[PDB]
Design a protein around this ligand. Structure first.
Ligand SMILES: Nc1nc2c(ncn2[C@@H]2O[C@H](COP(=O)(O)OP(=O)(O)NP(=O)(O)O)[C@@H](O)[C@H]2O)c(=O)[nH]1
Ligand code: MET
Ligand SMILES: [Mg+2]
Lengths: 404, 254, 17
RNA sequence: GCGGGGUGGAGCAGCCUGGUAGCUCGUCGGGCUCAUAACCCGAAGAUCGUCGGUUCAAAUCCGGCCCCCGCAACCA
């Protein structure tokens, strides 16, 4: 099963999904037919194996299949790890999902487009989201250099090397690529083999995981004799699940109240291959024994799964400590952030979930929020991200920490 | 072979015959109800003419002329009313169910279709009726319908046994549940509400339950007797509800 | 640090069609 | 996975309940009109997805295999 979760943030159509395609091969389908004329709409998913040509020279030594005879020669490249990606979308409005997605990341790669004006709305929006949540292991990537003047891509590298200054981004390297002709990708694999190291995770900890998809496997027409169970897609962060454990989902289904759903892990799968257990980094899918109605389209989106008989709060009202940006990096316009007024509706992005809520308390950096849909707060360390409907479309404006 | 209990058809009569030989000034036909009694049909009684003046398509006609003398007959297809053309067109499918029957029983019995028509069909002429119906009562009721009329008890059984199919009905249901092991209970209530049904609303052909929405499902009874349809189906759909409703699994017809 | 990069830019450019 | 349709060139009825393939256009010819395909007349042209079975007989009933359009949904 994949070791780690690398996110591919960035503006729209810079080719995020395409870079994922040159690295893994996989497409995100682009589905719902709509995505097929549009673009990535759900978080895309894909995995890959990274081995290295010991017996030759780098970056090219950075392989993809147990095969070195591609550069230098044969000695079956040594396997370093198997990684997974999370393709977000790029569209100014899918902000609410990409946020959500970050909650699973262990690191990222910022795909800027080589042939469009560097700090483009969403590129920034993302970047600052990254420095805000905590994803500090970053690799910027200059994508569409296969369509530019050898001057242009260097001058952009300048504006980048200059943005990456005052900000937290010391030597966040910048590896120009060609996601279309898959050029230079191996030096990208060497970047991501250096800088996006695979974090240790104490297993002993409470089994806890975030959900961001869920499907009804069942084909149009499978008979009842073999109706395969409900299936929950998401990522583990702390602990580890095993086949045949007893589990619950929070907040779970609603009545207006919100109760937890129990079931047994029917099965465990990463990519297309089945495993008996599952550990952090990656996305998994969990076969369950619950009525697939319950998780068709992606119902339990923003829900979390933990140990059955476990101690987690299903809050309706929450104590956020908090801070603001001075600007709204996400509108083409940078208008200065108005301080929070109470009785205001704000999107509270907590974990994978995306919930809406109203402001009851307004202090210096501690506001109290009342929510439509409960949030199961698993820790005291619960990072959150706070947004406001500026001009019809929502916008990332500030953050903080959940408090219990 | 449909042997006749007459030599010549009654003149002005209507029957099924078959085109044998297209000649220039008419053609020879063969009255299938009269041992293929060849007769004569001239253009003055016909009316793209190649598909009914075909080599073997079995037309229907009225007997213009019967010359009992020479033993020849002339027919026309003009003179066939279209009110006659249907009635005596169902009579056809009947009189050929029969043909087949004796055409295999006799063979089986290794005798003659002439002795299959003389014996079976001519005495079941007596007992008021198209013999294929005195056998439709027979096969259902008994061989004593055969023996009454005095039908030489040799064909009787070889007849009956040489004598003796789908319809589809479906429904949108809804099955919600929240049970920790829900899927399972689905499989259960469906396999308890689809139970002993093969014998209840009896013999049908096949029943299929599937998901076409996520709570919306389709049940599918296919069978032999149309009005056995929902009989089976509804019962099933009922016991869904009930057992669904007697095993914490909500179910409800659309 | 530009050298590493400027390098990278070189190496991709020399892989074009 | 069910459907829904498949028919002269075109647009399609006919298929339930089997018995010379129909329309409308277009073509073509001729007609009529002062000139118009405006009308009148004629021809041509679909072995009715495919493969097969039943049938005396099928575009029609029966089933495998295709070709678009609705349903479903990226199916761990
Ligand atoms: N010339 C060239 N075209 C590229 C390159 N990378 C991507 N493209 C083009 O850019 C288009 C956008 O691809 P896509 O991956 O959907 O963009 P996206 O950024 O993933 N969409 P989204 O932002 O919603 O995820 C594709 O049609 C692809 O052909 C590149 O390096 N060079
Ligand atoms: C499903 O394939 C899973 N085990 C991997 C993450 S969900 C796209
Ligand atoms: Mg895309």
């Amino acid at each position: 099963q994949p070791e780690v979760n690398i996110g591919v943030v960035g503006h729209v159509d810079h080719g995020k999904t395409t870079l994922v395609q040159a690295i893994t091969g996989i497409w995100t389908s682009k589905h719902s037919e709509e995505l097929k004329r549009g673009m990535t709409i759900k978080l895309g998913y894909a995995e890959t194996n990274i081995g290295v040509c010991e017996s030759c020279k780098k970056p090219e030594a950075y392989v993809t299949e147990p095969s070195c005879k591609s550069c230098g020669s044969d000695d079956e490249p040594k396997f370093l790890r198997r990684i997974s990606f999370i393709d977000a979308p790029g569209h100014e409005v899918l902000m609410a999902t990409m946020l959500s997605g970050a909650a699973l990341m262990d690191g990222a790669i910022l795909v800027v487009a080589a042939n469009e004006p560097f700090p483009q709305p969403q590129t920034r929006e993302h970047f600052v989201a990254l420095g805000i949540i905590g994803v500090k292991n970053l690799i910027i990537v200059q994508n569409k250099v296969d369509v530019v003047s050898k001057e242009e891509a260097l001058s952009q590298y300048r504006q980048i090397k200059q943005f990456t200054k005052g900000t937290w981004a010391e030597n966040v390297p910048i590896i120009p690529v060609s996601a279309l002709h898959k050029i230079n990708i191996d030096s990208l694999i060497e970047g991501i083999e250096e800088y996006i190291k695979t974090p240790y995770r104490d297993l002993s900890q409470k089994p806890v995981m975030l959900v961001i998809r869920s499907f009804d496997v069942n084909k149009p027409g499978t008979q009842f004799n073999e109706l395969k169970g409900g299936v929950i897609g998401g990522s583990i962060i702390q602990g580890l699940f095993k086949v045949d454990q007893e589990i619950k989902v929070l907040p779970g289904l609603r009545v207006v109240s919100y109760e937890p759903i129990f079931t047994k892990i029917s099965s465990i799968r990463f990519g297309d291959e089945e495993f008996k257990e599952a550990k952090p980094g990656g996305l998994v899918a969990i076969g369950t024994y619950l009525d697939p109605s319950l998780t068709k389209a992606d119902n339990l989106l923003g829900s979390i799964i933990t140990l059955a008989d476990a101690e987690v709060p299903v809050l309706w009202n929450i104590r956020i400590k908090y801070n603001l940006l001075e600007r709204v990096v996400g509108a083409k316009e940078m208008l200065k952030v108005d301080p929070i007024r109470a009785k205001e509706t704000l999107m509270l992005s907590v974990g994978s979930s995306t919930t809406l809520g109203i402001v009851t308390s307004v202090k210096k950096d501690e506001i109290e929020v009342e929510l439509r849909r409960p949030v199961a707060v698993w820790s005291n360390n619960i990072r959150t991200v706070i947004s406001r409907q500026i001009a019809g479309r929502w916008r990332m404006i500030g953050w903080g920490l959940v408090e219990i | 072979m449909i042997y006749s209990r007459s030599k010549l058809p009654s003149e002005g009569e209507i029957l099924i015959a078959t085109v044998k030989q297209v000649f220039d000034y008419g053609s020879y036909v063969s009255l299938d109800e009269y041992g293929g009694l060849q007769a004569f049909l001239p253009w003055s009684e016909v009316s793209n003419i190649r598909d009914v003046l075909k080599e073997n398509r079995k037309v229907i006609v009225k007997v213009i002329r019967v010359d009992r003398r020479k033993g020849t007959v002339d027919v026309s297809l003009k003179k066939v009313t279209d009110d006659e053309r249907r009635k005596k067109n169902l009579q056809w499918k009947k009189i050929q169910r029969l043909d087949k029957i004796l055409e295999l029983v006799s063979q089986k019995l290794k005798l003659s279709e002439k002795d299959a028509w003389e014996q079976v069909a001519w005495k079941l002429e007596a007992k008021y009726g198209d013999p294929i119906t005195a056998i439709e009562k027979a096969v259902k009721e008994g061989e004593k319908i055969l023996i009454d009329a005095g039908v030489p008890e040799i064909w009787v059984k070889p007849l009956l046994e040489e004598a003796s199919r789908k319809v589809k009905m479906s429904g949108l249901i809804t099955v919600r549940t929240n049970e920790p092991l829900g899927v399972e209970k689905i499989k259960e209530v469906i396999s308890k509400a689809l139970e002993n049904i093969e014998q209840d609303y009896e013999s049908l052909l096949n029943i299929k339950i599937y998901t076409i929405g996520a709570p919306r499902y389709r049940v599918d009874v296919v069978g032999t007797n149309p009005k056995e349809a929902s009989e089976a189906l509804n019962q099933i759909i009922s016991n869904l509800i009930k057992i669904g409703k007697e095993e914490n699994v909500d179910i409800s017809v659309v | 640090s530009e050298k590493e990069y400027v390098e990278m830019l070189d190496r991709l450019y020399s892989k074009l069609p």
